[PDB]
Amino acid sequence: QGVVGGRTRTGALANDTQGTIKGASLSVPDYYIKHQFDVGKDEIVNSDATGK
Amino acid sequence: VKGIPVVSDIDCPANKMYLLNLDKLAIYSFDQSDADQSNGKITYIPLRYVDE
């Protein structure tokens, strides 16, 4: 925050501080929540024709 | 032999002769084509045979 100092009516005009604005930076990670699977292509038709 | 054809082949066990009932001997292939992709990797040429 920019601190406020104050002065008299006709006193000096010294400065007072400002507030820092930081550039916050994240990134979608280079990583995944992945889940992969290999079905036997045989199983796909077989189970399609056989699953109860 | 009593109307049963006696077709022969080279790759038949030597001192044997099989009497087969072709309406009760079958070849079953697993048609896993339905689970193929539609790219073109798989082609499925039907197999060729010769009796002579």
Side-chain angles (χ1 to χ4, degrees):
Chain A
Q1 293 274 60
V3 180
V4 300
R7 71 158 150 93
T8 76
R9 290 285 180 182
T10 66
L13 261 178
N15 296 345
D16 54 359
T17 61
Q18 306 315 119
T20 63
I21 287 185
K22 296 296 297 182
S25 178
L26 283 177
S27 179
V28 190
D30 293 327
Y31 207 83
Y32 290 162
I33 315 297
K34 69 97 181 175
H35 173 283
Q36 75 165 355
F37 54 85
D38 62 357
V39 300
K41 189 172 291 207
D42 60 334
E43 183 176 359
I44 303 302
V45 290
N46 179 26
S47 298
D48 189 358
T50 314
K52 292 185 175 172
Chain B
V1 292
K2 206 159 283 294
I4 287 159
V6 176
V7 301
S8 65
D9 52 341
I10 308 314
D11 51 12
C12 179
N15 306 326
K16 287 179 190 174
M17 65 180 288
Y18 300 89
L19 200 172
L20 311 186
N21 194 330
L22 277 296
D23 292 88
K24 293 184 185 295
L25 268 174
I27 291 279
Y28 273 80
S29 84
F30 184 45
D31 189 358
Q32 66 163 47
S33 82
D34 267 357
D36 281 339
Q37 295 298 109
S38 49
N39 46 15
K41 293 278 190 63
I42 314 299
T43 61
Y44 285 124
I45 297 89
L47 186 150
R48 324 191 60 71
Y49 71 86
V50 292
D51 301 71
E52 211 77 35

Coordinates of all heavy atoms in Angstrom, one line a residue:
Chain A
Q1 N 0.8 -1.2 0.0 CA 0.0 0.0 0.0 C 0.9 1.2 0.0 O 2.0 1.2 0.6 CB -0.9 0.0 1.2 CG -2.0 -1.0 1.3 CD -3.2 -0.6 0.5 OE1 -3.2 -0.4 -0.7 NE2 -4.3 -0.6 1.2
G2 N 0.4 2.3 -0.7 CA 1.1 3.6 -0.6 C 0.9 4.3 0.7 O -0.2 4.9 0.8
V3 N 1.8 4.3 1.5 CA 1.7 5.0 2.8 C 1.5 6.5 2.6 O 2.1 7.0 1.6 CB 3.0 4.8 3.7 CG1 2.9 5.5 5.0 CG2 3.2 3.3 3.9
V4 N 0.6 7.1 3.4 CA 0.3 8.5 3.2 C 1.0 9.2 4.4 O 0.9 8.8 5.5 CB -1.2 8.7 3.2 CG1 -1.8 8.0 2.1 CG2 -1.8 8.2 4.5
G5 N 1.7 10.3 4.0 CA 2.4 11.1 5.0 C 1.7 12.3 5.6 O 1.6 12.4 6.8
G6 N 1.3 13.2 4.8 CA 0.7 14.4 5.3 C 1.7 15.6 5.3 O 2.9 15.4 5.5
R7 N 1.2 16.8 5.3 CA 2.0 18.0 5.3 C 1.1 19.1 5.8 O -0.1 19.0 5.9 CB 2.5 18.4 3.9 CG 1.4 18.8 3.0 CD 2.0 19.7 1.9 NE 1.1 19.5 0.7 CZ 0.1 20.4 0.4 NH1 -0.2 21.4 1.2 NH2 -0.6 20.2 -0.7
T8 N 1.7 20.2 6.2 CA 0.9 21.4 6.6 C 0.3 22.0 5.3 O 0.5 21.5 4.2 CB 1.8 22.4 7.3 OG1 2.6 23.1 6.3 CG2 2.7 21.7 8.3
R9 N -0.5 23.1 5.5 CA -1.0 23.8 4.4 C 0.0 24.2 3.4 O -0.1 23.9 2.2 CB -1.7 25.1 4.9 CG -3.0 24.9 5.6 CD -4.0 24.5 4.7 NE -5.3 24.3 5.4 CZ -6.4 23.9 4.8 NH1 -6.4 23.7 3.5 NH2 -7.5 23.7 5.5
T10 N 1.1 24.7 3.8 CA 2.1 25.3 3.0 C 3.5 24.7 3.2 O 4.5 25.3 2.8 CB 2.2 26.8 3.2 OG1 2.7 27.1 4.5 CG2 0.8 27.5 3.1
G11 N 3.6 23.6 3.9 CA 4.8 22.9 4.2 C 5.5 22.4 3.0 O 5.3 22.8 1.8
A12 N 6.4 21.4 3.2 CA 7.2 20.8 2.1 C 6.2 20.0 1.2 O 5.0 20.0 1.3 CB 8.3 20.0 2.6
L13 N 6.8 19.4 0.2 CA 6.1 18.5 -0.7 C 6.9 17.2 -0.9 O 7.1 16.7 -2.0 CB 5.8 19.1 -2.0 CG 4.3 19.7 -2.1 CD1 4.1 20.3 -3.5 CD2 3.4 18.6 -1.9
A14 N 7.5 16.7 0.2 CA 8.2 15.4 0.1 C 7.3 14.3 -0.3 O 6.0 14.4 -0.1 CB 8.8 15.1 1.5
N15 N 7.8 13.2 -0.9 CA 7.0 12.1 -1.4 C 6.6 11.2 -0.2 O 6.9 11.4 0.9 CB 7.8 11.3 -2.4 CG 8.1 12.1 -3.6 OD1 7.5 13.2 -3.9 ND2 9.1 11.6 -4.4
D16 N 5.9 10.2 -0.6 CA 5.6 9.1 0.3 C 5.4 7.8 -0.6 O 5.1 8.0 -1.8 CB 4.4 9.4 1.2 CG 3.2 9.8 0.4 OD1 3.3 9.9 -0.8 OD2 2.2 10.2 1.0
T17 N 5.5 6.7 0.0 CA 5.8 5.5 -0.8 C 4.5 5.1 -1.6 O 3.5 5.7 -1.5 CB 6.1 4.3 0.2 OG1 5.0 4.1 1.1 CG2 7.4 4.6 0.9
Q18 N 4.7 4.1 -2.5 CA 3.7 3.5 -3.3 C 3.4 2.1 -2.9 O 4.0 1.6 -2.0 CB 4.1 3.6 -4.8 CG 4.4 5.0 -5.3 CD 3.5 6.0 -4.8 OE1 3.8 6.9 -4.1 NE2 2.2 5.8 -5.2
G19 N 2.6 1.4 -3.7 CA 2.2 0.0 -3.5 C 2.8 -0.8 -4.6 O 2.7 -0.5 -5.8
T20 N 3.4 -1.9 -4.2 CA 4.0 -2.9 -5.2 C 3.0 -3.7 -5.9 O 2.1 -4.2 -5.2 CB 5.0 -3.8 -4.5 OG1 4.3 -4.6 -3.5 CG2 6.1 -3.0 -3.7
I21 N 3.1 -3.8 -7.2 CA 2.3 -4.7 -8.0 C 3.2 -5.8 -8.5 O 4.1 -5.5 -9.4 CB 1.6 -3.9 -9.1 CG1 0.4 -3.1 -8.5 CG2 1.1 -4.9 -10.1 CD1 -0.4 -2.5 -9.6
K22 N 3.0 -7.0 -8.1 CA 3.9 -8.1 -8.5 C 3.1 -8.9 -9.6 O 1.9 -9.0 -9.5 CB 4.2 -9.0 -7.3 CG 5.0 -8.4 -6.2 CD 6.4 -8.0 -6.8 CE 7.1 -9.2 -7.2 NZ 8.5 -8.9 -7.7
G23 N 3.9 -9.4 -10.5 CA 3.3 -10.2 -11.6 C 3.3 -11.6 -11.2 O 4.3 -12.3 -11.3
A24 N 2.2 -12.1 -10.7 CA 2.1 -13.5 -10.3 C 1.9 -14.4 -11.6 O 1.2 -14.0 -12.5 CB 0.9 -13.7 -9.4
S25 N 2.6 -15.5 -11.6 CA 2.8 -16.3 -12.8 C 2.7 -17.8 -12.5 O 3.6 -18.3 -11.8 CB 4.1 -16.0 -13.5 OG 4.3 -16.8 -14.6
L26 N 1.6 -18.4 -12.9 CA 1.6 -19.9 -12.8 C 1.6 -20.5 -14.3 O 1.6 -19.7 -15.2 CB 0.3 -20.3 -12.1 CG 0.5 -20.2 -10.6 CD1 -0.8 -20.6 -9.9 CD2 1.6 -21.1 -10.1
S27 N 1.6 -21.8 -14.3 CA 1.6 -22.4 -15.6 C 0.8 -23.7 -15.5 O 1.0 -24.5 -14.5 CB 3.0 -22.7 -16.1 OG 3.0 -23.4 -17.4
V28 N 0.0 -24.0 -16.5 CA -0.6 -25.3 -16.6 C 0.6 -26.3 -16.8 O 1.4 -26.1 -17.6 CB -1.5 -25.4 -17.9 CG1 -2.3 -26.7 -17.9 CG2 -2.5 -24.3 -17.9
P29 N 0.7 -27.3 -15.9 CA 2.0 -28.0 -15.8 C 2.2 -28.8 -17.1 O 1.2 -29.1 -17.9 CB 1.8 -29.0 -14.6 CG 0.3 -29.1 -14.6 CD -0.3 -27.8 -15.0
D30 N 3.4 -29.3 -17.3 CA 3.7 -30.1 -18.5 C 3.3 -31.5 -18.2 O 3.8 -32.4 -19.0 CB 5.2 -30.0 -18.8 CG 5.6 -28.6 -19.3 OD1 4.7 -28.0 -20.0 OD2 6.7 -28.1 -19.0
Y31 N 2.5 -31.8 -17.3 CA 2.1 -33.1 -16.7 C 0.7 -33.3 -16.9 O -0.1 -32.4 -17.1 CB 2.5 -33.1 -15.2 CG 2.9 -34.4 -14.6 CD1 4.2 -34.9 -14.8 CD2 1.9 -35.2 -13.9 CE1 4.5 -36.1 -14.2 CE2 2.3 -36.4 -13.4 CZ 3.6 -36.8 -13.5 OH 3.9 -38.1 -13.0
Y32 N 0.3 -34.6 -16.9 CA -1.1 -35.1 -17.0 C -1.5 -36.0 -15.9 O -0.7 -36.5 -15.1 CB -1.2 -35.9 -18.3 CG -1.2 -35.0 -19.6 CD1 -1.0 -35.6 -20.8 CD2 -1.3 -33.7 -19.5 CE1 -0.9 -34.9 -21.9 CE2 -1.3 -32.9 -20.7 CZ -1.1 -33.5 -21.9 OH -1.0 -32.8 -23.0
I33 N -2.8 -36.1 -15.8 CA -3.5 -36.9 -14.8 C -3.8 -38.3 -15.5 O -4.7 -39.0 -15.1 CB -4.8 -36.3 -14.3 CG1 -4.6 -34.8 -14.0 CG2 -5.2 -36.9 -13.0 CD1 -3.6 -34.5 -12.9
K34 N -3.0 -38.5 -16.5 CA -3.3 -39.5 -17.5 C -3.7 -40.9 -17.0 O -3.4 -41.3 -15.9 CB -2.1 -39.7 -18.5 CG -0.9 -40.4 -17.8 CD -0.9 -41.8 -18.1 CE 0.3 -42.5 -17.4 NZ 0.2 -44.0 -17.7
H35 N -4.5 -41.6 -17.9 CA -4.8 -43.0 -17.7 C -5.0 -43.6 -19.1 O -5.9 -43.2 -19.8 CB -6.1 -43.2 -16.8 CG -6.6 -44.6 -16.7 ND1 -7.2 -45.2 -17.8 CD2 -6.5 -45.5 -15.7 CE1 -7.5 -46.4 -17.4 NE2 -7.1 -46.6 -16.1
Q36 N -4.1 -44.6 -19.4 CA -4.3 -45.2 -20.7 C -4.4 -46.7 -20.5 O -4.0 -47.3 -19.5 CB -3.1 -44.9 -21.7 CG -1.9 -45.6 -21.4 CD -0.9 -45.6 -22.5 OE1 -1.2 -45.1 -23.6 NE2 0.3 -46.1 -22.3
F37 N -5.0 -47.4 -21.5 CA -5.2 -48.8 -21.5 C -5.2 -49.4 -22.9 O -5.5 -48.7 -23.9 CB -6.6 -49.1 -20.9 CG -7.7 -48.4 -21.5 CD1 -8.3 -48.9 -22.7 CD2 -8.2 -47.2 -21.0 CE1 -9.4 -48.2 -23.3 CE2 -9.2 -46.5 -21.6 CZ -9.8 -47.1 -22.7
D38 N -4.7 -50.6 -23.0 CA -4.7 -51.3 -24.2 C -5.7 -52.5 -24.2 O -5.5 -53.5 -23.5 CB -3.2 -51.8 -24.6 CG -2.6 -52.7 -23.6 OD1 -3.2 -53.0 -22.5 OD2 -1.5 -53.2 -23.8
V39 N -6.8 -52.3 -24.9 CA -7.7 -53.4 -25.1 C -7.2 -54.3 -26.2 O -6.6 -53.9 -27.2 CB -9.1 -52.9 -25.5 CG1 -9.6 -52.1 -24.3 CG2 -9.1 -52.2 -26.8
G40 N -7.3 -55.6 -26.1 CA -7.1 -56.5 -27.2 C -8.2 -56.2 -28.2 O -9.4 -56.1 -27.9
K41 N -7.9 -55.9 -29.5 CA -8.9 -55.6 -30.5 C -9.8 -56.8 -30.6 O -11.0 -56.7 -31.0 CB -8.2 -55.3 -31.8 CG -9.2 -54.8 -32.8 CD -8.4 -54.3 -34.1 CE -7.7 -53.0 -33.8 NZ -7.5 -52.2 -35.0
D42 N -9.3 -58.0 -30.3 CA -10.1 -59.2 -30.3 C -11.2 -59.1 -29.2 O -12.3 -59.5 -29.4 CB -9.2 -60.4 -30.0 CG -8.5 -60.3 -28.7 OD1 -8.3 -59.2 -28.2 OD2 -8.2 -61.4 -28.1
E43 N -10.8 -58.6 -28.0 CA -11.7 -58.5 -26.9 C -12.9 -57.6 -27.2 O -14.0 -57.8 -26.6 CB -10.9 -58.1 -25.7 CG -11.7 -58.0 -24.4 CD -10.8 -57.7 -23.3 OE1 -9.6 -57.5 -23.5 OE2 -11.3 -57.6 -22.1
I44 N -12.7 -56.6 -28.0 CA -13.8 -55.6 -28.3 C -14.9 -56.3 -29.0 O -16.1 -56.1 -28.6 CB -13.2 -54.4 -29.0 CG1 -12.1 -53.8 -28.3 CG2 -14.3 -53.4 -29.2 CD1 -12.4 -53.4 -26.9
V45 N -14.7 -57.0 -30.1 CA -15.7 -57.7 -30.8 C -16.2 -58.9 -30.0 O -17.4 -59.1 -30.0 CB -15.3 -58.1 -32.2 CG1 -15.1 -56.8 -33.0 CG2 -14.0 -58.8 -32.1
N46 N -15.3 -59.6 -29.4 CA -15.7 -60.8 -28.7 C -16.6 -60.5 -27.5 O -17.7 -61.1 -27.4 CB -14.5 -61.5 -28.1 CG -14.8 -62.7 -27.3 OD1 -15.9 -63.3 -27.5 ND2 -14.0 -63.1 -26.4
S47 N -16.3 -59.5 -26.7 CA -17.1 -59.1 -25.6 C -18.4 -58.4 -26.1 O -19.5 -58.5 -25.5 CB -16.4 -58.1 -24.7 OG -15.3 -58.8 -24.1
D48 N -18.4 -57.7 -27.2 CA -19.6 -57.1 -27.8 C -20.5 -58.2 -28.2 O -21.8 -58.0 -28.1 CB -19.2 -56.2 -29.0 CG -20.4 -55.4 -29.5 OD1 -21.5 -55.6 -29.0 OD2 -20.2 -54.7 -30.5
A49 N -20.0 -59.4 -28.5 CA -20.9 -60.5 -28.9 C -21.1 -61.5 -27.8 O -21.8 -62.5 -28.0 CB -20.2 -61.2 -30.1
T50 N -20.5 -61.2 -26.6 CA -20.5 -62.3 -25.6 C -20.9 -61.7 -24.2 O -21.3 -62.5 -23.4 CB -19.2 -62.9 -25.5 OG1 -18.7 -63.3 -26.9 CG2 -19.2 -64.2 -24.8
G51 N -20.8 -60.4 -24.0 CA -21.0 -59.8 -22.7 C -22.5 -60.0 -22.3 O -23.4 -59.7 -23.0
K52 N -22.7 -60.5 -21.0 CA -24.0 -60.7 -20.5 C -24.7 -59.3 -20.2 O -25.9 -59.1 -20.4 CB -24.0 -61.5 -19.3 CG -23.7 -63.0 -19.6 CD -23.8 -63.8 -18.3 CE -23.5 -65.3 -18.6 NZ -23.5 -66.1 -17.4
Chain B
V1 N -14.8 -94.7 -52.3 CA -15.1 -95.9 -51.6 C -16.5 -95.8 -51.0 O -16.7 -95.0 -50.1 CB -14.1 -96.1 -50.4 CG1 -12.7 -96.4 -51.0 CG2 -13.9 -94.9 -49.6
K2 N -17.4 -96.5 -51.6 CA -18.8 -96.3 -51.3 C -19.3 -94.9 -51.4 O -20.0 -94.3 -50.5 CB -19.1 -96.9 -49.9 CG -20.5 -97.4 -49.7 CD -20.5 -98.4 -48.5 CE -20.0 -99.7 -48.9 NZ -20.9 -100.3 -49.9
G3 N -18.9 -94.2 -52.5 CA -19.2 -92.9 -52.8 C -18.5 -91.8 -52.0 O -18.6 -90.6 -52.3
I4 N -17.6 -92.2 -51.1 CA -16.8 -91.3 -50.3 C -15.6 -91.0 -51.1 O -14.8 -91.9 -51.4 CB -16.4 -91.9 -49.0 CG1 -17.7 -91.9 -48.0 CG2 -15.4 -91.1 -48.3 CD1 -17.5 -92.9 -46.9
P5 N -15.4 -89.7 -51.6 CA -14.2 -89.4 -52.3 C -13.0 -89.6 -51.4 O -13.0 -89.4 -50.2 CB -14.4 -87.9 -52.6 CG -15.9 -87.7 -52.6 CD -16.3 -88.6 -51.5
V6 N -11.9 -89.9 -52.1 CA -10.6 -90.3 -51.4 C -9.5 -89.3 -51.8 O -8.4 -89.7 -52.1 CB -10.3 -91.7 -51.6 CG1 -9.0 -92.1 -51.0 CG2 -11.4 -92.6 -51.0
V7 N -9.9 -88.0 -51.9 CA -8.9 -87.0 -52.3 C -7.7 -87.1 -51.3 O -7.9 -87.4 -50.1 CB -9.5 -85.6 -52.1 CG1 -10.7 -85.4 -53.1 CG2 -9.9 -85.3 -50.7
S8 N -6.5 -86.9 -51.9 CA -5.3 -87.1 -51.1 C -4.5 -85.8 -51.2 O -4.7 -84.9 -52.0 CB -4.5 -88.2 -51.7 OG -4.1 -87.9 -53.0
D9 N -3.5 -85.7 -50.3 CA -2.6 -84.6 -50.2 C -1.3 -85.0 -49.7 O -1.1 -86.0 -49.0 CB -3.1 -83.4 -49.4 CG -3.5 -83.8 -48.1 OD1 -3.7 -85.0 -47.8 OD2 -3.7 -82.9 -47.2
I10 N -0.2 -84.2 -50.0 CA 1.1 -84.6 -49.6 C 1.3 -84.4 -48.1 O 1.9 -85.3 -47.5 CB 2.1 -83.7 -50.4 CG1 1.8 -83.8 -51.9 CG2 3.5 -84.2 -50.1 CD1 1.6 -85.2 -52.4
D11 N 0.8 -83.4 -47.5 CA 1.0 -83.1 -46.1 C -0.1 -83.7 -45.2 O -0.7 -83.1 -44.4 CB 1.0 -81.6 -45.9 CG -0.1 -80.9 -46.5 OD1 -1.1 -81.5 -46.9 OD2 0.0 -79.6 -46.6
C12 N -0.4 -85.0 -45.4 CA -1.2 -85.8 -44.6 C -0.4 -86.9 -44.0 O 0.5 -87.5 -44.6 CB -2.3 -86.5 -45.5 SG -3.5 -87.6 -44.6
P13 N -0.7 -87.2 -42.7 CA 0.2 -88.2 -42.0 C 0.3 -89.5 -42.8 O -0.7 -90.0 -43.3 CB -0.6 -88.4 -40.7 CG -1.2 -87.1 -40.4 CD -1.6 -86.6 -41.8
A14 N 1.5 -90.1 -42.9 CA 1.8 -91.0 -43.9 C 0.9 -92.2 -43.9 O 0.2 -92.5 -44.9 CB 3.3 -91.4 -43.8
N15 N 1.0 -93.0 -42.9 CA 0.3 -94.3 -42.9 C -1.1 -94.1 -42.3 O -1.5 -94.9 -41.4 CB 1.1 -95.3 -42.1 CG 2.5 -95.5 -42.7 OD1 2.7 -95.3 -43.9 ND2 3.4 -95.7 -41.8
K16 N -1.9 -93.1 -42.7 CA -3.2 -92.9 -42.2 C -4.1 -92.5 -43.3 O -3.6 -92.0 -44.3 CB -3.2 -91.7 -41.1 CG -2.6 -92.1 -39.8 CD -2.6 -91.0 -38.8 CE -1.8 -91.3 -37.6 NZ -1.7 -90.2 -36.7
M17 N -5.4 -92.6 -43.1 CA -6.4 -92.1 -44.0 C -7.6 -91.8 -43.2 O -8.2 -92.6 -42.5 CB -6.7 -93.2 -45.1 CG -7.3 -94.4 -44.7 SD -7.6 -95.6 -46.0 CE -9.0 -94.9 -46.9
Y18 N -7.9 -90.5 -43.2 CA -9.0 -89.9 -42.4 C -10.3 -89.9 -43.2 O -10.3 -89.5 -44.3 CB -8.7 -88.5 -42.0 CG -7.4 -88.3 -41.2 CD1 -6.2 -88.1 -41.8 CD2 -7.4 -88.4 -39.8 CE1 -5.0 -88.0 -41.1 CE2 -6.3 -88.3 -39.1 CZ -5.1 -88.1 -39.7 OH -4.0 -87.9 -39.0
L19 N -11.4 -90.4 -42.6 CA -12.7 -90.3 -43.2 C -13.3 -89.1 -42.5 O -13.4 -89.1 -41.2 CB -13.5 -91.5 -43.1 CG -14.7 -91.6 -44.1 CD1 -15.3 -93.0 -44.0 CD2 -15.7 -90.6 -43.8
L20 N -13.7 -88.1 -43.2 CA -14.1 -86.8 -42.7 C -15.6 -86.5 -43.1 O -15.9 -86.8 -44.2 CB -13.3 -85.7 -43.1 CG -11.8 -85.9 -42.9 CD1 -11.1 -84.6 -43.3 CD2 -11.5 -86.2 -41.5
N21 N -16.4 -86.0 -42.2 CA -17.7 -85.5 -42.5 C -17.7 -84.0 -42.6 O -17.7 -83.3 -41.6 CB -18.7 -86.0 -41.5 CG -20.1 -85.9 -41.9 OD1 -20.5 -85.0 -42.7 ND2 -21.0 -86.8 -41.4
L22 N -17.6 -83.5 -43.8 CA -17.4 -82.1 -44.0 C -18.6 -81.2 -43.6 O -18.4 -80.0 -43.4 CB -17.0 -81.8 -45.5 CG -15.5 -82.0 -45.8 CD1 -14.7 -81.0 -45.0 CD2 -15.1 -83.3 -45.4
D23 N -19.8 -81.8 -43.5 CA -20.8 -81.0 -42.9 C -20.7 -81.0 -41.4 O -21.5 -80.3 -40.7 CB -22.2 -81.6 -43.3 CG -22.5 -81.4 -44.8 OD1 -22.1 -82.2 -45.6 OD2 -23.1 -80.3 -45.1
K24 N -19.8 -81.7 -40.8 CA -19.5 -81.7 -39.4 C -18.1 -81.4 -39.0 O -17.7 -81.6 -37.9 CB -20.0 -83.0 -38.7 CG -21.5 -83.2 -38.9 CD -22.0 -84.4 -38.2 CE -23.5 -84.5 -38.4 NZ -24.2 -83.4 -37.8
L25 N -17.3 -81.0 -40.0 CA -16.0 -80.4 -39.7 C -16.0 -79.0 -40.3 O -16.2 -78.8 -41.4 CB -14.9 -81.2 -40.4 CG -14.3 -82.3 -39.6 CD1 -13.3 -83.2 -40.4 CD2 -13.5 -81.7 -38.4
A26 N -15.7 -78.0 -39.4 CA -15.8 -76.7 -39.8 C -14.5 -75.9 -39.4 O -13.8 -76.3 -38.5 CB -17.0 -76.0 -39.1
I27 N -14.3 -74.8 -40.1 CA -13.2 -73.9 -39.8 C -13.9 -72.6 -39.3 O -14.8 -72.0 -39.9 CB -12.4 -73.5 -41.1 CG1 -11.6 -74.7 -41.5 CG2 -11.5 -72.4 -40.8 CD1 -10.3 -74.9 -40.7
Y28 N -13.5 -72.2 -38.1 CA -14.0 -71.0 -37.5 C -12.9 -70.0 -37.4 O -11.9 -70.2 -36.8 CB -14.6 -71.3 -36.1 CG -16.0 -71.7 -36.1 CD1 -16.4 -73.0 -36.5 CD2 -17.0 -70.9 -35.8 CE1 -17.7 -73.4 -36.5 CE2 -18.3 -71.2 -35.9 CZ -18.7 -72.5 -36.2 OH -20.0 -72.9 -36.2
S29 N -13.1 -68.8 -37.9 CA -12.2 -67.7 -37.8 C -12.9 -66.6 -37.0 O -14.1 -66.4 -37.0 CB -11.8 -67.1 -39.1 OG -12.7 -66.2 -39.6
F30 N -12.1 -65.9 -36.2 CA -12.6 -64.8 -35.3 C -12.6 -63.5 -36.1 O -11.5 -62.9 -36.4 CB -11.7 -64.8 -34.1 CG -12.2 -63.8 -33.1 CD1 -13.5 -63.7 -32.7 CD2 -11.3 -62.9 -32.4 CE1 -13.9 -62.9 -31.8 CE2 -11.7 -62.0 -31.5 CZ -13.1 -62.0 -31.2
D31 N -13.8 -63.0 -36.3 CA -14.0 -61.8 -37.2 C -13.8 -60.6 -36.3 O -14.8 -60.0 -35.8 CB -15.3 -61.8 -37.9 CG -15.4 -60.7 -38.9 OD1 -14.5 -59.9 -39.0 OD2 -16.5 -60.6 -39.6
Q32 N -12.6 -60.2 -36.0 CA -12.3 -59.0 -35.2 C -12.1 -57.8 -36.1 O -11.4 -56.9 -35.7 CB -11.0 -59.2 -34.4 CG -9.7 -59.4 -35.1 CD -8.5 -59.2 -34.3 OE1 -8.4 -59.7 -33.1 NE2 -7.6 -58.5 -34.8
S33 N -12.7 -57.8 -37.3 CA -12.6 -56.6 -38.2 C -13.5 -55.5 -37.7 O -13.1 -54.3 -37.9 CB -13.1 -57.0 -39.6 OG -14.5 -57.0 -39.7
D34 N -14.5 -55.8 -36.9 CA -15.4 -54.7 -36.5 C -14.8 -53.8 -35.6 O -15.1 -52.6 -35.5 CB -16.7 -55.3 -35.9 CG -17.8 -55.5 -36.8 OD1 -17.7 -55.1 -38.0 OD2 -18.9 -56.0 -36.4
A35 N -13.7 -54.2 -34.8 CA -13.0 -53.4 -33.9 C -11.8 -52.8 -34.6 O -11.0 -52.1 -33.9 CB -12.6 -54.2 -32.7
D36 N -11.6 -52.9 -35.9 CA -10.5 -52.2 -36.6 C -10.8 -50.7 -36.6 O -12.0 -50.3 -36.5 CB -10.4 -52.8 -38.0 CG -9.6 -54.0 -38.0 OD1 -8.8 -54.3 -37.1 OD2 -9.7 -54.7 -39.1
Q37 N -9.8 -50.0 -36.9 CA -10.0 -48.5 -37.2 C -10.5 -48.4 -38.6 O -10.7 -49.4 -39.3 CB -8.7 -47.8 -37.0 CG -8.2 -47.8 -35.5 CD -9.1 -47.1 -34.6 OE1 -9.8 -47.7 -33.8 NE2 -9.2 -45.8 -34.7
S38 N -10.7 -47.2 -39.1 CA -11.1 -46.9 -40.4 C -10.0 -46.2 -41.2 O -10.3 -45.5 -42.2 CB -12.4 -46.1 -40.5 OG -12.3 -45.0 -39.6
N39 N -8.7 -46.4 -40.8 CA -7.6 -45.7 -41.4 C -7.2 -46.4 -42.7 O -7.2 -45.8 -43.8 CB -6.4 -45.6 -40.5 CG -6.2 -47.0 -39.8 OD1 -6.7 -48.0 -40.2 ND2 -5.4 -46.9 -38.7
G40 N -6.9 -47.7 -42.7 CA -6.4 -48.4 -43.9 C -5.2 -49.3 -43.6 O -4.7 -49.9 -44.5
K41 N -4.8 -49.4 -42.3 CA -3.8 -50.3 -41.9 C -4.1 -51.8 -42.2 O -3.3 -52.6 -42.6 CB -3.4 -50.1 -40.5 CG -2.8 -48.8 -40.1 CD -1.3 -48.7 -40.5 CE -0.7 -47.5 -39.9 NZ -0.8 -47.5 -38.4
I42 N -5.4 -52.1 -42.0 CA -5.9 -53.5 -42.1 C -6.6 -53.7 -43.4 O -7.3 -52.8 -43.8 CB -6.8 -53.8 -40.9 CG1 -6.2 -53.3 -39.6 CG2 -7.0 -55.3 -40.8 CD1 -4.9 -54.0 -39.3
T43 N -6.4 -54.8 -44.0 CA -6.9 -55.0 -45.4 C -7.8 -56.2 -45.6 O -8.8 -56.2 -46.3 CB -5.8 -55.0 -46.4 OG1 -4.9 -56.1 -46.1 CG2 -5.0 -53.7 -46.3
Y44 N -7.4 -57.4 -44.9 CA -8.3 -58.6 -44.9 C -8.5 -59.1 -46.4 O -9.5 -59.0 -47.0 CB -9.6 -58.3 -44.3 CG -9.6 -58.2 -42.8 CD1 -10.0 -57.1 -42.1 CD2 -9.0 -59.2 -42.1 CE1 -10.0 -57.0 -40.8 CE2 -9.0 -59.2 -40.7 CZ -9.5 -58.1 -40.1 OH -9.4 -58.0 -38.7
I45 N -7.4 -59.6 -46.9 CA -7.5 -60.4 -48.2 C -7.9 -61.8 -47.8 O -7.4 -62.4 -46.9 CB -6.2 -60.4 -48.9 CG1 -5.8 -59.0 -49.3 CG2 -6.2 -61.3 -50.1 CD1 -4.9 -58.3 -48.3
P46 N -8.9 -62.4 -48.6 CA -9.3 -63.7 -48.3 C -8.3 -64.7 -48.8 O -7.8 -64.6 -49.9 CB -10.7 -63.9 -49.0 CG -10.5 -62.9 -50.2 CD -9.7 -61.8 -49.6
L47 N -8.0 -65.8 -48.0 CA -7.0 -66.7 -48.3 C -7.3 -67.5 -49.5 O -8.5 -67.9 -49.8 CB -6.7 -67.6 -47.1 CG -5.5 -68.5 -47.2 CD1 -5.0 -68.7 -45.8 CD2 -6.0 -69.8 -47.7
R48 N -6.3 -67.8 -50.3 CA -6.4 -68.6 -51.6 C -6.0 -70.0 -51.4 O -4.9 -70.2 -50.7 CB -5.6 -67.9 -52.7 CG -5.6 -66.4 -52.7 CD -5.0 -65.9 -53.9 NE -5.8 -66.3 -55.1 CZ -7.0 -65.8 -55.4 NH1 -7.6 -64.9 -54.6 NH2 -7.6 -66.2 -56.5
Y49 N -6.7 -71.0 -51.9 CA -6.3 -72.4 -51.8 C -6.4 -73.0 -53.2 O -7.1 -72.5 -54.1 CB -7.2 -73.1 -50.8 CG -8.6 -73.3 -51.3 CD1 -9.0 -74.4 -52.1 CD2 -9.6 -72.4 -51.0 CE1 -10.3 -74.6 -52.5 CE2 -10.9 -72.6 -51.4 CZ -11.3 -73.7 -52.2 OH -12.5 -73.9 -52.6
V50 N -5.7 -74.1 -53.4 CA -5.7 -74.9 -54.6 C -5.9 -76.4 -54.2 O -5.2 -76.9 -53.2 CB -4.4 -74.7 -55.4 CG1 -4.4 -73.4 -56.0 CG2 -3.3 -74.9 -54.6
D51 N -6.7 -77.1 -54.9 CA -6.8 -78.5 -54.7 C -5.9 -79.4 -55.5 O -5.5 -80.5 -55.0 CB -8.3 -79.0 -54.9 CG -9.3 -78.2 -54.1 OD1 -9.5 -77.0 -54.3 OD2 -9.9 -78.9 -53.2
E52 N -5.5 -78.9 -56.6 CA -4.5 -79.6 -57.5 C -3.3 -78.7 -57.6 O -3.2 -77.6 -57.0 CB -5.1 -79.9 -58.8 CG -4.6 -81.1 -59.5 CD -5.1 -82.4 -58.9 OE1 -6.3 -82.4 -58.5 OE2 -4.4 -83.4 -58.8

